[PDB]
Scaffold this active site. Structure first.
Site, PDB file in Angstrom:
ATOM      1  N   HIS A  68       0.841  -1.225   0.000  1.00  0.00           N
ATOM      2  CA  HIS A  68       0.000   0.000   0.000  1.00  0.00           C
ATOM      3  C   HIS A  68       0.866   1.262   0.000  1.00  0.00           C
ATOM      4  O   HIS A  68       0.704   2.134   0.874  1.00  0.00           O
ATOM      5  CB  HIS A  68      -0.979  -0.059   1.159  1.00  0.00           C
ATOM      6  CG  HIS A  68      -2.068  -1.034   0.913  1.00  0.00           C
ATOM      7  ND1 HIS A  68      -2.125  -2.229   1.555  1.00  0.00           N
ATOM      8  CD2 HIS A  68      -3.122  -0.990   0.070  1.00  0.00           C
ATOM      9  CE1 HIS A  68      -3.180  -2.893   1.127  1.00  0.00           C
ATOM     10  NE2 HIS A  68      -3.806  -2.154   0.210  1.00  0.00           N
ATOM     11  N   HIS A  72       1.980   1.462  -5.690  1.00  0.00           N
ATOM     12  CA  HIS A  72       0.585   0.987  -5.832  1.00  0.00           C
ATOM     13  C   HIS A  72      -0.285   2.142  -6.348  1.00  0.00           C
ATOM     14  O   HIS A  72      -1.068   1.909  -7.266  1.00  0.00           O
ATOM     15  CB  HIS A  72       0.082   0.387  -4.527  1.00  0.00           C
ATOM     16  CG  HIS A  72      -1.381   0.137  -4.510  1.00  0.00           C
ATOM     17  ND1 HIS A  72      -1.962  -0.878  -5.222  1.00  0.00           N
ATOM     18  CD2 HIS A  72      -2.381   0.761  -3.864  1.00  0.00           C
ATOM     19  CE1 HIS A  72      -3.265  -0.877  -5.006  1.00  0.00           C
ATOM     20  NE2 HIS A  72      -3.547   0.121  -4.186  1.00  0.00           N
ATOM     21  N   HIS A 106      -5.954   7.175  -3.440  1.00  0.00           N
ATOM     22  CA  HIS A 106      -6.997   6.292  -2.848  1.00  0.00           C
ATOM     23  C   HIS A 106      -6.464   5.534  -1.626  1.00  0.00           C
ATOM     24  O   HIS A 106      -7.299   4.947  -0.918  1.00  0.00           O
ATOM     25  CB  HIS A 106      -7.553   5.318  -3.889  1.00  0.00           C
ATOM     26  CG  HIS A 106      -6.676   4.134  -4.120  1.00  0.00           C
ATOM     27  ND1 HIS A 106      -5.527   4.207  -4.863  1.00  0.00           N
ATOM     28  CD2 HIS A 106      -6.783   2.849  -3.711  1.00  0.00           C
ATOM     29  CE1 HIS A 106      -4.953   3.010  -4.896  1.00  0.00           C
ATOM     30  NE2 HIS A 106      -5.710   2.161  -4.210  1.00  0.00           N
ATOM     31  N   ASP A 107      -5.150   5.481  -1.411  1.00  0.00           N
ATOM     32  CA  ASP A 107      -4.550   4.719  -0.284  1.00  0.00           C
ATOM     33  C   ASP A 107      -3.617   5.636   0.527  1.00  0.00           C
ATOM     34  O   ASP A 107      -2.818   5.112   1.321  1.00  0.00           O
ATOM     35  CB  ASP A 107      -3.848   3.451  -0.770  1.00  0.00           C
ATOM     36  CG  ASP A 107      -4.748   2.219  -0.877  1.00  0.00           C
ATOM     37  OD1 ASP A 107      -5.763   2.137  -0.153  1.00  0.00           O
ATOM     38  OD2 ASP A 107      -4.402   1.310  -1.660  1.00  0.00           O
ATOM     39  N   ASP A 217      -7.862  -1.000  -8.649  1.00  0.00           N
ATOM     40  CA  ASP A 217      -7.259  -1.372  -7.355  1.00  0.00           C
ATOM     41  C   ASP A 217      -6.729  -2.802  -7.407  1.00  0.00           C
ATOM     42  O   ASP A 217      -5.686  -3.048  -6.777  1.00  0.00           O
ATOM     43  CB  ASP A 217      -8.246  -1.154  -6.220  1.00  0.00           C
ATOM     44  CG  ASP A 217      -7.529  -0.989  -4.901  1.00  0.00           C
ATOM     45  OD1 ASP A 217      -6.400  -0.485  -4.923  1.00  0.00           O
ATOM     46  OD2 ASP A 217      -8.097  -1.386  -3.873  1.00  0.00           O
ATOM     47  N   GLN A 269      -5.472 -17.974  -3.547  1.00  0.00           N
ATOM     48  CA  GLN A 269      -5.500 -17.167  -4.800  1.00  0.00           C
ATOM     49  C   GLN A 269      -6.646 -17.626  -5.718  1.00  0.00           C
ATOM     50  O   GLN A 269      -7.362 -16.740  -6.236  1.00  0.00           O
ATOM     51  CB  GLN A 269      -4.132 -17.187  -5.472  1.00  0.00           C
ATOM     52  CG  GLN A 269      -3.077 -16.375  -4.716  1.00  0.00           C
ATOM     53  CD  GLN A 269      -3.365 -14.890  -4.745  1.00  0.00           C
ATOM     54  OE1 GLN A 269      -3.542 -14.275  -5.803  1.00  0.00           O
ATOM     55  NE2 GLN A 269      -3.433 -14.296  -3.566  1.00  0.00           N
TER      56      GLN A 269
HETATM   57  C1  LIG Z   1      -4.007 -10.576  -5.397  1.00  0.00           C
HETATM   58  N1  LIG Z   1      -4.728  -9.515  -4.686  1.00  0.00           N
HETATM   59  N2  LIG Z   1      -4.861  -8.220  -5.146  1.00  0.00           N
HETATM   60  C2  LIG Z   1      -5.543  -7.558  -4.253  1.00  0.00           C
HETATM   61  C3  LIG Z   1      -5.900  -8.399  -3.192  1.00  0.00           C
HETATM   62  C4  LIG Z   1      -6.717  -7.955  -2.036  1.00  0.00           C
HETATM   63  O1  LIG Z   1      -7.628  -8.597  -1.568  1.00  0.00           O
HETATM   64  N3  LIG Z   1      -6.535  -6.780  -1.451  1.00  0.00           N
HETATM   65  C5  LIG Z   1      -7.429  -6.413  -0.322  1.00  0.00           C
HETATM   66  C6  LIG Z   1      -6.654  -5.793   0.822  1.00  0.00           C
HETATM   67  O2  LIG Z   1      -5.488  -5.125   0.340  1.00  0.00           O
HETATM   68  C7  LIG Z   1      -4.639  -5.857  -0.571  1.00  0.00           C
HETATM   69  C8  LIG Z   1      -5.440  -5.918  -1.886  1.00  0.00           C
HETATM   70  C9  LIG Z   1      -5.364  -9.648  -3.489  1.00  0.00           C
HETATM   71  C10 LIG Z   1      -5.455 -10.905  -2.704  1.00  0.00           C
HETATM   72  O3  LIG Z   1      -4.577 -11.746  -2.725  1.00  0.00           O
HETATM   73  N4  LIG Z   1      -6.555 -11.131  -2.005  1.00  0.00           N
HETATM   74  C11 LIG Z   1      -6.744 -12.284  -1.262  1.00  0.00           C
HETATM   75  C12 LIG Z   1      -5.764 -13.187  -1.004  1.00  0.00           C
HETATM   76  C13 LIG Z   1      -6.123 -14.315  -0.227  1.00  0.00           C
HETATM   77  N5  LIG Z   1      -5.378 -15.339   0.169  1.00  0.00           N
HETATM   78  C14 LIG Z   1      -6.137 -16.155   0.907  1.00  0.00           C
HETATM   79  C15 LIG Z   1      -5.610 -17.323   1.579  1.00  0.00           C
HETATM   80  C16 LIG Z   1      -4.225 -17.480   1.621  1.00  0.00           C
HETATM   81  C17 LIG Z   1      -3.697 -18.550   2.310  1.00  0.00           C
HETATM   82  C18 LIG Z   1      -4.529 -19.431   2.974  1.00  0.00           C
HETATM   83  C19 LIG Z   1      -5.888 -19.221   2.962  1.00  0.00           C
HETATM   84  C20 LIG Z   1      -6.454 -18.148   2.289  1.00  0.00           C
HETATM   85  C21 LIG Z   1      -7.390 -15.674   1.014  1.00  0.00           C
HETATM   86  N6  LIG Z   1      -7.406 -14.524   0.261  1.00  0.00           N
HETATM   87  C22 LIG Z   1      -8.376 -13.627   0.043  1.00  0.00           C
HETATM   88  C23 LIG Z   1      -8.085 -12.520  -0.723  1.00  0.00           C
HETATM   89  C24 LIG Z   1      -9.080 -11.542  -0.999  1.00  0.00           C
HETATM   90  N7  LIG Z   1      -9.867 -10.745  -1.259  1.00  0.00           N
HETATM   91 MG   LIG Z   2      -7.341   0.767   0.014  1.00  0.00          MG
HETATM   92 ZN   LIG Z   3      -5.427   0.306  -3.198  1.00  0.00          ZN
END
Ligand SMILES: Cn1ncc(C(=O)N2CCOCC2)c1C(=O)Nc1cc2nc(-c3ccccc3)cn2cc1C#N
Ligand SMILES: [Mg+2]
Ligand SMILES: [Zn+2]
EC number: 3.1.4.17
Length: 313
Positions: A68, A72, A106-107, A217, A269
Site C-alpha cells: 500500500h 501501488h 486512494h490509499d 485497485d 489465490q
Molecule cells: C491478489 N490480490 N490483489 C488484491 C488483493 C486484495 O484482496 N486486497 C485487499 C486488501 O489489500 C490488498 C489488496 C489480493 C489478494 O490476494 N486477495 C486475497 C488473497 C487471499 N489469500 C487467501 C488465503 C491465503 C492462504 C490461505 C488461505 C487463504 C485468502 N485470500 C483472500 C483474498 C481476498 N480478497
Molecule cells: Mg485501500
Molecule cells: Zn489500493
C-alpha cells in the site's frame, strides 16, 4: 502550455496497454502520472506548477509499506488511464480529472493494515469512522493536501464543478473498500441483465465508476505472470505482518494473514480470482466492452495459479 512530457519509445507504446508495469525507477513515476493526465484530460486541465506540487505532497504521504505504497498509487492510476483512454466518449471532462487524482490518492497514509485490524486494535480512526475506516481517512488526507497553499489543482473550476469533482473523488475512494464491492457488482449485474442500466442515471454512473475503482485497485491480477506473482509477495508481506499483530492482541488471524499457512496460498489465490477478480472484470467487460484485455489477463493468471497447485510451478 507548450511543454509536453514525452517518454522513451518502449514506455510511450507500452503505457497505452492495460498490462503495463511502471518499472522500478521511482523518479520516473511522477512524469509517468503527468504524461497520463496530459493525454487523458489535456495539457490544460491542471497548472503544471500546482500539479507537480500536489504529486510530490501525495508521494510524501504514502508510507514505506510493502504493498500500500506510492508504487501501488501510480499503478492504480495507470490502470484507470487505460480504461479512460479505451472508453474515450463515455466520461465527462470532470470525471477524467477526478478519477486519475482519486486513484493516485486512494490509499494515502495507509499503514499496511485492514479496517478489521484498526477496529480490533481500537485505533482512533475506528472511533472517527465506523465503516470504510481507512477509505474515509484516505479521502480526508486528499482534501488536506488539496488545501495546502499552492496545491489546489482544481482552483480554475466553478464552485459547482469543484463540489462535483470532490464528490466524484470521495465516492471513488470509498468504493475501493472491498467490503462494498460485492453488493456494488451484484446491483450492476442485476441492472445490466434486466437491461435497466442507464449511464445518464447519476446513481448508475456512481456504481460503474465504483466498479472501475475496484478493477484498477485489483490490477496486479491483470499483469504478466511475473509482475502478478512478485506483487503477491508484497500483498502477503503486509497480510502476514497484520496476522503477527493479531496474534499480539491474543486473536488467531484468518489463514490469509497466518504466515504459518503459506502452504495454502495458491488455493487462497483461486478463491480470490473466482470470488472477486473474475466477477469484477466480467461485469466491467459487460458494461465497458473495450476493458476485455483485463478479464483475459485475469483468466490467464487464474490459469497460472492452477498450474502452481498442480506442482507444475
Ligand atoms: C491478489 N490480490 N490483489 C488484491 C488483493 C486484495 O484482496 N486486497 C485487499 C486488501 O489489500 C490488498 C489488496 C489480493 C489478494 O490476494 N486477495 C486475497 C488473497 C487471499 N489469500 C487467501 C488465503 C491465503 C492462504 C490461505 C488461505 C487463504 C485468502 N485470500 C483472500 C483474498 C481476498 N480478497
Ligand atoms: Mg485501500
Ligand atoms: Zn489500493
Amino acid at each position: 502550455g507548450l511543454m509536453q512530457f514525452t517518454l522513451p519509445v518502449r514506455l510511450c507504446k507500452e503505457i497505452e496497454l492495460f498490462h503495463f508495469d511502471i518499472g522500478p525507477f521511482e523518479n520516473m513515476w511522477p512524469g509517468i502520472f503527468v504524461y497520463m493526465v496530459h493525454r487523458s484530460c489535456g495539457t490544460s486541465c491542471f497548472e503544471l506548477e500546482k500539479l507537480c506540487r500536489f504529486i510530490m505532497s501525495v508521494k510524501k504521504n504514502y508510507r514505506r509499506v510493502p504493498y500500500h505504497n506510492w508504487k501501488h498509487a501510480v499503478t492504480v492510476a495507470h490502470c484507470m488511464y487505460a480504461i479512460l483512454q479505451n472508453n474515450h466518449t463515455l466520461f465527462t471532462d470532470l470525471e477524467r480529472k477526478g478519477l486519475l487524482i482519486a486513484c493516485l490518492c486512494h490509499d494515502l497514509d495507509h499503514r499496511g493494515f485492514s479496517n478489521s485490524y484498526l477496529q480490533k486494535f481500537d485505533h482512533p480512526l475506528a472511533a472517527l469512522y465506523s465503516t470504510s475506516t481507512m477509505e474515509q481517512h484516505h479521502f480526508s488526507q486528499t482534501v488536506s493536501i488539496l488545501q495546502l497553499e499552492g496545491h489546489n489543482i482544481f482552483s480554475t473550476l466553478s464552485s459547482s464543478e469543484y463540489e462535483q469533482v470532490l464528490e466524484i473523488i470521495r465516492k471513488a475512494i470509498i468504493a475501493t473498500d472491498l467490503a462494498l464491492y460485492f453488493g456494488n457488482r451484484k446491483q450492476l449485474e442485476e441492472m445490466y441483465q434486466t437491461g435497466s442500466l442507464n449511464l445518464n442515471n447519476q446513481s448508475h454512473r456512481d456504481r460503474v465508476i465504483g466498479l472501475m475503482m475496484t478493477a484498477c485497485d485489483l490490477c496486479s491480477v491483470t499483469k504478466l505472470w511475473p509482475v502478478t506473482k512478485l506483487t503477491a509477495n508484497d500483498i502477503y508481506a503486509e497480510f502476514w505482518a497484520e496476522g503477527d499483530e493479531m496474534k499480539k492482541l491474543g486473536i488467531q488471524p484468518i489463514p490469509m494473514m497466518d504466515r504459518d499457512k503459506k502452504d495454502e496460498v495458491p488455493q487462497g489465490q483461486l478463491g480470490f480470482y473466482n470470488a472477486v477478480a473474475i466477477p469484477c472484470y466480467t461485469t466491467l467487460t459487460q458494461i465497458l466492452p473495450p476493458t476485455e484485455p483485463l478479464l483475459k489477463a485475469c483468466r490467464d493468471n487464474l490459469s497460472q495459479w492452477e498450474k502452481v497447485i498442480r506442482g507444475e510451478e
